[PDB]
């Protein structure tokens, strides 16, 4: 039985996919840590 969970935390177990180059200021499809979406990526002044 594999009991796994995902939340707002750094990930430890991932799938075998190779990272690519990031494109900024364009409407692109993004895949961040398994979270898929569509939007525009910009440099951020926010603080995590």
């Amino acid at each position: 039985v594999l009991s796994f969970e995902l939340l707002n935390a750094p990930a430890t177990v991932c799938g075998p996919k190779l990272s690519t180059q990031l494109v900024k200021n364009q409407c692109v499809n993004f895949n961040f840590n398994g979270l898929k979406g569509t939007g525009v990526l910009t440099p951020s002044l926010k603080r995590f």
């Binding site: 409407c27 979406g37 569509t38 939007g39």
Partner: protein
């Protein structure tokens, strides 16, 4: 039955009355509210 009251002096009074006339005009979009930037959700929304 034989007495009356007649005024001998007067006054001028200015009173304020406030009445609303119009309100804010609001426009909505079914896209980028219900589905956002998502083609899969937008495909299912075409029937509505």
């Amino acid at each position: 039955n034989n007495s009356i009251a007649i005024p001998t002096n007067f006054s001028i009074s200015v009173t304020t009355e406030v009445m609303p006339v119009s309100m804010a005009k609001t426009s909505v979009d079914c896209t980028m509210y219900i589905c956002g930037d998502s083609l899969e959700c937008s495909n299912l929304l075409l029937q509505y």
